Design an enzyme around this catalytic site. Structure first.
Site, PDB file in Angstrom:
ATOM      1  N   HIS B  52      -3.456   4.381   1.788  1.00 58.70           N
ATOM      2  CA  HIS B  52      -3.031   5.524   2.582  1.00 58.70           C
ATOM      3  C   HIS B  52      -4.168   6.050   3.458  1.00 58.70           C
ATOM      4  CE1 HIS B  52       0.728   6.792  -0.008  1.00 58.70           C
ATOM      5  NE2 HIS B  52       0.730   5.503   0.304  1.00 58.70           N
ATOM      6  N   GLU B  54      -5.359   9.119   3.788  1.00 59.48           N
ATOM      7  CA  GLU B  54      -6.326   9.965   3.078  1.00 59.48           C
ATOM      8  C   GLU B  54      -7.309   9.205   2.265  1.00 59.48           C
ATOM      9  OE1 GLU B  54      -2.858  10.136   3.280  1.00 59.48           O
ATOM     10  OE2 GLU B  54      -2.410  11.958   2.128  1.00 59.48           O
ATOM     11  N   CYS B  82       0.513  12.670  -0.883  1.00 59.44           N
ATOM     12  CA  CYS B  82       1.315  12.220  -1.984  1.00 59.44           C
ATOM     13  C   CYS B  82       0.512  12.539  -3.259  1.00 59.44           C
ATOM     14  CB  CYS B  82       1.587  10.711  -1.814  1.00 59.44           C
ATOM     15  SG  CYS B  82       0.147   9.702  -2.266  1.00 59.44           S
ATOM     16  N   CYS B  85      -2.903  10.675  -3.392  1.00 59.55           N
ATOM     17  CA  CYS B  85      -3.927  11.240  -2.462  1.00 59.55           C
ATOM     18  C   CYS B  85      -4.346  12.651  -2.800  1.00 59.55           C
ATOM     19  CB  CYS B  85      -3.436  11.188  -0.998  1.00 59.55           C
ATOM     20  SG  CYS B  85      -3.187   9.479  -0.423  1.00 59.55           S
TER      21      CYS B  85
END
Ligand code: ZN
Ligand code: ZN
Lengths: 146, 146
Positions: B52, B54, B82, B85
């Site tokens: 992801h 992040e 999420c 993260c």
């Protein structure tokens, strides 16, 4: 499935983390009774807050399978996964997580929070705890004493 | 702190993710008004369930600071983080997360779950939402329509 045989390998990886002076956690990701990822804790050394055992093992598994989804795998780890790693296991769509010692303070598989069976995740990971429990705890205890 | 100026850069990174045919999320980590990490969503392409925006930006930040702790940083991201993260931001000990659109189904900063102010984390991340909200939503909406 002789979970101790796989946890023993995880403890092997945890002791690598110990030799590196990192909290000693190891992990192995198993698919069809073969290892497809290994990991050990190394945030301090890698200057990487995300470099937990589980993250490293799930990443290898993705390379080995050429797939970000890791269906029907079992992830073994010497300590209950944290929130960050529990979320990673959910995104990875793994079948099962087997862990050694509980992390009573911040474990995220039924200790502090149970992310793995939280009622809005699109995927449920099965949990088995306490495998080689005393072996896993003693590593971490000796670490903190140190 | 002109949060739109930094979110605009994040949207720039999100559009990289879009060109790669990945859910279009971008992130930038800012320390003393300088960018110290950038990220965009690429799990499918990297075969990496953890890849992801992040995660990629927090990892860069660690390299740039030579430290796994990223004190007093602000992480900008085009979508609510999420669970995976959100846990990473907590381990990273960042000061603040600023996000564009909410993730109503699985967002972990007050949508599905609020990991960032859960009463057992050893660190609290401040939250600011809705920055360039409509810009961030439209990217994701056009993606799903596609
Ligand atoms: Zn973890
Ligand atoms: Zn995420």
């Amino acid at each position: 499935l002789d979970h101790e045989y796989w946890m023993r390998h995880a403890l092997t990886l945890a002791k690598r983390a110990w030799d590196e002076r990192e909290v000693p956690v190891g992990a192995v990701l198993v698919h069809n009774h073969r290892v497809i990822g290994e990991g050990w804790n190394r945030p301090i050394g890698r200057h990487d807050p995300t470099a937990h055992a589980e993250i490293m093992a799930l990443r290898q598994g993705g390379l080995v399978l050429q797939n970000y989804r890791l269906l029907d795998t079992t992830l073994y780890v010497t300590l209950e996964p944290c929130v960050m790693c529990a979320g990673a296991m959910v995104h990875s769509r793994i079948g099962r997580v087997v862990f050694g010692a509980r992390d009573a303070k911040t474990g995220a598989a039924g200790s502090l929070i149970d992310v793995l069976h939280h009622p809005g995740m699109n995927h449920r990971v099965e949990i088995i705890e306490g495998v080689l429990r005393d072996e896993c705890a003693t590593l971490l205890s000796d670490f903190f004493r140190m």
